[PDB]
Design a protein around this ligand. Sequence first.
Ligand SMILES: Cc1cc2nc3c(=O)[nH]c(=O)nc-3n(C[C@H](O)[C@H](O)[C@H](O)COP(=O)(O)OP(=O)(O)OC[C@H]3O[C@@H](n4cnc5c(N)ncnc54)[C@H](O)[C@@H]3O)c2cc1C
Ligand SMILES: Cc1cc2nc3c(=O)[nH]c(=O)nc-3n(C[C@H](O)[C@H](O)[C@H](O)COP(=O)(O)OP(=O)(O)OC[C@H]3O[C@@H](n4cnc5c(N)ncnc54)[C@H](O)[C@@H]3O)c2cc1C
Ligand SMILES: Cc1cc2nc3c(=O)[nH]c(=O)nc-3n(C[C@H](O)[C@H](O)[C@H](O)COP(=O)(O)OP(=O)(O)OC[C@H]3O[C@@H](n4cnc5c(N)ncnc54)[C@H](O)[C@@H]3O)c2cc1C
Ligand SMILES: Cc1cc2nc3c(=O)[nH]c(=O)nc-3n(C[C@H](O)[C@H](O)[C@H](O)COP(=O)(O)OP(=O)(O)OC[C@H]3O[C@@H](n4cnc5c(N)ncnc54)[C@H](O)[C@@H]3O)c2cc1C
Lengths: 378, 378, 378, 378
Amino acid sequence: AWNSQQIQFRKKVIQFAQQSLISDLIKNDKEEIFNRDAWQKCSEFGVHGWPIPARYGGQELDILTTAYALQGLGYGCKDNGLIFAMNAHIWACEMPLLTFGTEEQKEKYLPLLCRGGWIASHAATEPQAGSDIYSLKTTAQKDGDKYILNGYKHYVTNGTIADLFIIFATIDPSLGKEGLTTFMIEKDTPGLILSKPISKMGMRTAEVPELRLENCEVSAANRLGEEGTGLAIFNHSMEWERGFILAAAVGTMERLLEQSIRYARSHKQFGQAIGKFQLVANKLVEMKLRLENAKAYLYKVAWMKENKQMALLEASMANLYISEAWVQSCLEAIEIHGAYGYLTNTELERELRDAIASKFYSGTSEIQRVVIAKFLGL
Amino acid sequence: AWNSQQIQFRKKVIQFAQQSLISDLIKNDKEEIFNRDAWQKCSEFGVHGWPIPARYGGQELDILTTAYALQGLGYGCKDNGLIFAMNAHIWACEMPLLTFGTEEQKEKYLPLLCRGGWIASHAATEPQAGSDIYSLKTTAQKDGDKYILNGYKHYVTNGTIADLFIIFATIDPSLGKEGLTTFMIEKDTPGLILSKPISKMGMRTAEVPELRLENCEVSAANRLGEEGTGLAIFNHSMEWERGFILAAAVGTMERLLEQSIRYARSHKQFGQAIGKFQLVANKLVEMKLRLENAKAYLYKVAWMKENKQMALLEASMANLYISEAWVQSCLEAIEIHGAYGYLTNTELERELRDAIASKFYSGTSEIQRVVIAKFLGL
Amino acid sequence: AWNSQQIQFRKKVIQFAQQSLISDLIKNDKEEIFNRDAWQKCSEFGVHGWPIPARYGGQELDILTTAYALQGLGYGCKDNGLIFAMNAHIWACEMPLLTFGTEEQKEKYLPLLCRGGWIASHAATEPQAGSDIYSLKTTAQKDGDKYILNGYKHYVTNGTIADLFIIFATIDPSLGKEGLTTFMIEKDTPGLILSKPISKMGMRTAEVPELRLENCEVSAANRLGEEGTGLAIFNHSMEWERGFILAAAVGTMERLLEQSIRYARSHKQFGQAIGKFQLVANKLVEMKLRLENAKAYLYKVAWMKENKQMALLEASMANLYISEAWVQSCLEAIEIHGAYGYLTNTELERELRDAIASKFYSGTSEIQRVVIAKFLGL
Amino acid sequence: AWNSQQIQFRKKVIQFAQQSLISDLIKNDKEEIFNRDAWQKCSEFGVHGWPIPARYGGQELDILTTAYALQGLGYGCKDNGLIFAMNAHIWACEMPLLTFGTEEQKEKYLPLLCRGGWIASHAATEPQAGSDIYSLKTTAQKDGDKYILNGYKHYVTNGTIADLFIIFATIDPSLGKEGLTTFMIEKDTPGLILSKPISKMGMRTAEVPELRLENCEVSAANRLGEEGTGLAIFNHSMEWERGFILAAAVGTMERLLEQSIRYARSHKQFGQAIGKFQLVANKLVEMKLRLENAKAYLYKVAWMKENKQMALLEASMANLYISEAWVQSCLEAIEIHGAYGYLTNTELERELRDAIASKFYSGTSEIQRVVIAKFLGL
Ligand SMILES: Cc1cc2nc3c(=O)[nH]c(=O)nc-3n(C[C@H](O)[C@H](O)[C@H](O)COP(=O)(O)OP(=O)(O)OC[C@H]3O[C@@H](n4cnc5c(N)ncnc54)[C@H](O)[C@@H]3O)c2cc1C
Ligand SMILES: Cc1cc2nc3c(=O)[nH]c(=O)nc-3n(C[C@H](O)[C@H](O)[C@H](O)COP(=O)(O)OP(=O)(O)OC[C@H]3O[C@@H](n4cnc5c(N)ncnc54)[C@H](O)[C@@H]3O)c2cc1C
Ligand SMILES: Cc1cc2nc3c(=O)[nH]c(=O)nc-3n(C[C@H](O)[C@H](O)[C@H](O)COP(=O)(O)OP(=O)(O)OC[C@H]3O[C@@H](n4cnc5c(N)ncnc54)[C@H](O)[C@@H]3O)c2cc1C
Ligand SMILES: Cc1cc2nc3c(=O)[nH]c(=O)nc-3n(C[C@H](O)[C@H](O)[C@H](O)COP(=O)(O)OP(=O)(O)OC[C@H]3O[C@@H](n4cnc5c(N)ncnc54)[C@H](O)[C@@H]3O)c2cc1C
C-alpha cells in the first residue's frame, strides 16, 4: 500500500546510509565511539526534522512515511547505537516540545534540535524510580520567576553530548502524579553534573552517563507546560517512544534475514546447502513470520498517530513484540552461521548485544505486559 | 481503517449469528449432528455468495469485506464445524469453479451452490497422497466423450451431504504433476461410493466420510479446465483455502479473549480477582498479542487477493500462524477457568478440540513451513 | 540403577496390564464407563497395597520400586481414568490414614482399602476454595462425642463409588489455617448428598461428582488427627499426590514415544519415511528429552520419600513438569500421525484429552509455580 | 545422595576458587587475557588429574565425584573461559589418550598434562568439515616409520599455548569414515603453523586460533590407536566432551539463581520487592526447574561413564539441554536486574556472552538433535 514517492524516498534513505554513513564499526563498538560525523550527515539529510513541521525547520513528513523511511534507515545503517541515540532525541525530546511547548519555546529550541546541531536528552528515570516513574524524587522548588532543581537521574541517553536536557521533576512529592513537572535545562547550567558514559553490553556507540542536579536554577520560561502537566508530557512521550524507537530495528531484522538466507543457500555441509536441512530452514521461516508481524505492529501505530488517535496500547504492544522478536531473530542468525556467527569480525554478535537494550529502554517487557493488562480491563 | 458500511455489515452478521443460529451445541457435538437448518439460513443471508459475482446469484462483495464479515461470523457463531463445512464449500469448490470453469459450467453449477441449497465437496487427498498430493493414484481414462474414474479418496468434507464433487484425478500417472486433471461429478452417479462420516476429536458437526470411485463415468463437459490443468486448479484453491478458512477462527479467538477477561475479573481467589495475579493476566496479554497478529495475517491476504495478486506465501503464513495461535489461546482459556474449563457444560473444551483440526486441514503446519522455505529461496 | 527384582516386577506389571486389563476404551470413554472389573483385578494383583505395610494387608514395597512399577502400569494400561482413580485412592486417602491414623483407625480402614474392595475419596476443594484451600467454608461443630458437618465440596474423585470419604473441614472459620480438621465419613451416612458424575473433556472413565453435607454426624473416633491438624494432613497428602499421581503418566509418555517412532519409520511421503524430515524427527527428539526429564523428577521424589524426607518442593516441581510434558508430547504424537491422529478410532486424541486433567488436579501449574517461588524465598 | 566426603571436597573446591582464583575479570574479558596463573594453581590443586589414575600422576577420582567437584568449580570460579580451556584439555585430550594410548604413550604424555604444566589441544574441525566431521580433508601420508601431515584446522582451543596437539587426519580420503586416524604432535614441530587467537563474543579468556599443517612429520609411535581407529577415538572423545564440558556451567547456573533471588528480594519498586510480582518470580521458578534438570542430565552421564557404559546418547542429551538452559537462565538473570543487568560492571552480560559458545563447541544444538534421532531409529 506504499506509493511511488514512499518507495523512492526509502530507497534514497537506504542508498544514503549505505554510501555516506560507512564507519569502522568493530572499532567504534569495542572502543565505545559515538559517530558525531554520521549524526551531522543525518541531520543534513533531514532525519531529525522528519516528523517536525517545516515552520521549525522540519521536513513535515507524515508518520507512515517517517516510519517507512526509518525502517529503510535501519536496513541501510549498521550502527544501532547511532539509530537509538537519534530516536531518543526525536521521539522523547523534540515530540513533547512540539506538543506541549509555547510558540516562543518552540521557535527558540525546535529549529536548533531540527537543523542547528543541538542534541537533546530525556532525563526521567532514577535509582528508585525506573518502572515506578511516578515515584520521582527530583524536586523543583519555586523562587519567584525561577525553580531550584535537586535530584539524581541514572541512564541519560546523549547526556555527555546534549545541549538541552528534558527533565522530569516534582513541585511537591506529597501530590504524587499530580506534582510532576517538566523543565528544559541548557548544557553548562550551574548545578548540572554529568558522569562519564557507563559501559554496557551493546549500544556502545550511544553515550549513556548519570546525571546529578545540585541546586540547578531554571527560569519559569523554560518550564515545559504548566505545573502538574509532567505526567501528561511523559505519557505522550512514551506513546512516540515505544511506537517509533524500534521502527529502524524492523529494518535491521530485514537485513539479517537476507544475510542469513544468503548463508543458508551458500554454506554447504553433507553435500548440500545448510538451508536444505529443515532445522536450518525453519529458523528463517520463524525470522520471516516475526519480520511481517513487526511491520504490522509498526504500521498500525504509525497510522493511528497520523490520524491523531491515542495509541499507548498499540505502542506498548509494538515495543513488547519488536524488542523480543529482534533478540530472537539475532540469536537465530548466529545459530544459522554456526561458530562463524560467534566471531567478532562477522558482526552478528554485536547485533544481538544491541538488540537486548530494547528490552530495557522505553520500559521493560514486563511493564508493557502490565500496561496491556490494564487496557484489557484487569 | 474499516468504513461505516463494513462496521455495520459485520455487526449485522454477528446479530444474525447470535439470534437465528442458536443450537444445542453440547448435544450436536456429542451426537455428531450437522446443522442443516443453520446452513440453509446462512445461504438465505448470503454467506455462500459473499465472494461470488451477482450474475451467478452471488453478493459480489470485495475480499476485505468478506474476511471482515467472516471474522464477525466466527465471533457470533459457536458452531465451528458448520463454519468449517461452509468455508470448504466456498473456497475449495465455488472459487476454482468461478476461476477455471467455462461460461456454461459456471451458469449451471454456480447459481445452485449460491442459492439452490446444493452442497459441494473437494476430494483430492488419498491414503498414500496427503502432503505429497502430486503422487495421486486416482486415474481418469478417456473413452470418447466420457472419462472412467477409479480410485479412493479419504477425508471428504461434506461428502455424505454433497450434491457436487470436485475430484482431482490423473489421465496418465507417468506424467506426474502434468497429468493432474479436475472433474465435477454429481451426487449418486453409478460408481460414487461413500462411507459413514468418520468420528473425530472436534469439528463433529461437520461430516467427513471416505470416498471410493468404481468405474465412475463422467462427461468431458463436466471436466474442470483442460487435461493437465489440475495442478494449477489445486494451487489456486489452496491459496483461497489457506488464507480464508481460518478468517472465522480469528472471530472465535476474539470471543474467547473477552469471555476469559470477564472470568479473570469475576472469579475471586485469595481475596482478589484472579486477573490481579500476573500469571493469569499474562495469559490474556498473550491472547491479545496473538489476536492482533492473526488479524494482520488475515487482512494482508485479503488485500493482496482483492488487488488480484498471487498470495500463496501470505496464505501459508496466515494458515500456519492462525491455526497454532487458535490452539494455544484455546488451551489458555481453559487454564484461566481452572478445573471449571475442563467440564463439558462450560464449552471451552470443545473450542480446543475444534481448533486442532486447523493444524491438519488446508495442509499441516510442517507443510506450510516447507512452502515458506521454498518462497525464501531454499 | 534398577536391580533384577525391580526389572522383573515391572515386566510382570506390564504383562498383567497388557493381558488381563483389556477394555473397549473407545466405548468406555464415549459412554463414561468406570471399569470396576479392572479396579478389582488391580487390587487382587496388589497395586493398592504397594506402599502399604503387610500388617494392614499391603505389599510393603519401597517407594522407588512402587514408582518404577506404577510407570510400568502406565505403559501397559491404556485406561488413564482408572489409573487416576486408583492413584487418588492410594496417595490422597490411604497415605494420610497410614501416617496420621491411630492403631484402631488403621486396623479398621486400611485393610479394607487394600484388599476389601473399599474405595476412598478425598473431598477438600470448594467453589470458593480451590487454589485458596485454607479458606474452607465446610464447618464441623462438636456436640459432645460427635461433630456436625455442613458444607459443599465440588470435584470429588470416586465419590459415586466410594465407601469412605476423607473430608477437610473447619472447627472455627475465625482460626482459618489453624482451624482445619480431617474427618472419615462412611458412605450413606445421613446428610452426605452426592450428585451425578460430572461430564468432562478426558478422564471420562473416572467418576467425579459433587458433594453436599447437610448436618452430617460423625463420631470423634472417626476424626483423623487432633483438632487443627488438618493443614499438616493436607500438606502431607499433597506431597504424595503431586509426586506420585503422574508416575504412570511417565509410562504413558514412553508408550506414545515408541508408537510415534514406529509410525515415523513406517509411514512414507515424498518417497521416504516421514522421520527422514527433520521437522518430524525433532518432535520425537523433544518427546525423548521430556521422557528422561520426567523420569528424573519422579525418581528424585521417590528417593526422598523412601529416605523419610519432606519433599513438597520436589513433588511440586515433578507435578508441574510432568503434567505439561505429558500434554505437549500428546499434541506432538497427534501431529506426527497427521489427520490420522485426529480420528477417534486411532485413540491418540483421547490421550491428549486425559493429559489436560493433570494441569488441574493436585493443583494448577500456576499454584505449583507460586509454591516453588515461596520455597526459593520470594 | 552425596556423602560427607563429596560435600566436603566440593566445599573445598568452592573455597579454593573463591580465595585463590581472584582475577580482574572485566579487564581480562575486554583485553582477551588467558589466566596462566589460575591454570597453574588449578593443576597444583589437582583439577586436571581428577579423572586420571594416580599411576600417571592423577587424582583418580570417580566420575560422579569429578562431576560434583566440577559443579563446585563453576560456582566458585567466575572465569568461564578458563573453565572451558581446562575441560577441553581434560575431556578431549587426556581422556582419549588414557583409553586408546599404549603404555609407553600414556607413561610419557599423561604425567606431563596432569602435573608438568603441559597444555593440550584437540584439532578435528575444518572449514569444510564442522558438523560433517567424516569429510575431513587433512591427509596423513606414510613414509616407512613416519607420516606426512597436510591440512587446515580452524577453531583449535588452547592452540597458541598448547604443548601437545591431538590431530584427526585421514590416511586415504577415498576410505571416508574408515580412513580416519589420530596423531599426537608436539609444539614447535616443523610444519605446525598457528594464527593469532580469534576474537569472539564470549569465552575471551580462552585462546582459540587457527592451525595449518605444511608437511608436518610425525613418528608412527606418536599415532594414537591403529590406522582407521580415528572415528572410534573421536566418538569416545565426544562422549566425555558433551557430557562433562558443561558440568561447571551447572555450577554457574546455581550462582546466577542465588544472585537473582537476592536481587528479587532486595530491589524494590511500587512499594514492594520485585519478586512479589509473578512475572519476576516466575523467571526464578524457571531458573530453578532448569538447574534441577541440568543436574539430572549431568549425573546420569557421570554414573554411566563410571559404570563403563557407552553414553553418547546421554552425553548428547546433556549437552543439548544444559547449553540451552544456560543461555536462557543468563538472559533471565539480566531481565530480573533490568537496565542494571545490561551494564559491563554488573558482569551478568559476560555470563550470557560466554553461555552462547556452548551452543557451538562439542557440536551444535541441531547436530545433537540429529544424533538423538539416529539413536531413536530415525
Ligand atoms: C477435518 C479434516 C477435513 C479434511 N477435508 C478434506 C477434504 O475435504 N478434501 C481433501 O482433499 N482433504 C481433506 N483433508 C485432508 C487433509 O488436508 C490432510 O490432513 C492433509 O492433506 C495432510 O495429510 P495427512 O494427514 O495424510 O498426513 P501426512 O501427509 O501422512 O504426513 C504425515 C506427517 O508427516 C509430516 N510430513 C509429511 N511430509 C513432510 C514433508 N515433506 N516435510 C516435513 N514434514 C512432512 C507432516 O507434518 C505429517 O504430520 C481433511 C483433513 C481433516 C483433518
Ligand atoms: C479431574 C479432577 C478431579 C479432581 N478431584 C478432586 C478430588 O477428589 N478432591 C478435591 O478436593 N479436589 C479435586 N479436584 C479439584 C482440583 O484440585 C482443582 O482443579 C484445583 O483445586 C484448582 O481448581 P480451581 O479451578 O477451583 O482453582 P481456581 O481457584 O478456580 O483458579 C482460577 C485460576 O486462577 C489461577 N490462580 C488462582 N489463584 C492463583 C494465585 N494465587 N496465583 C496465581 N494464579 C492463581 C489458577 O491458575 C487458575 O487457572 C479435582 C479437579 C479435577 C480437574
Ligand atoms: C569456542 C569454540 C571452540 C572450539 N574449539 C574447537 C577445538 O578445540 N577443536 C575442534 O576440532 N573444534 C572446535 N570448535 C569447532 C566447533 O566444534 C564447531 O562449532 C562445530 O564443529 C560446528 O561447526 P560449524 O560451526 O563449522 O557449523 P556448520 O557445521 O558449518 O553448520 C552450519 C549450520 O548448519 C547446521 N547444520 C549443519 N549440518 C546439519 C545437519 N546435518 N542437520 C541439521 N542442521 C545442520 C548447524 O546447525 C549450523 O548452525 C570450536 C568452536 C567454538 C565456537
Ligand atoms: C540503554 C538504556 C538507555 C536509557 N536511556 C534513558 C534515558 O535517556 N532517559 C530515561 O529517563 N531513562 C532511560 N533509561 C532507563 C530505562 O527506561 C530503564 O531500563 C527502565 O526505566 C526500567 O529500569 P529498571 O531496570 O531501573 O527497572 P526496575 O524498576 O529496577 O525493574 C526491576 C525488574 O522488576 C520488574 N518489575 C518492576 N516493577 C514491576 C511491576 N510492576 N510488574 C512486574 N514486573 C515488574 C521488571 O521486569 C524489571 O526487570 C535507559 C535504559 C537503558 C538500558
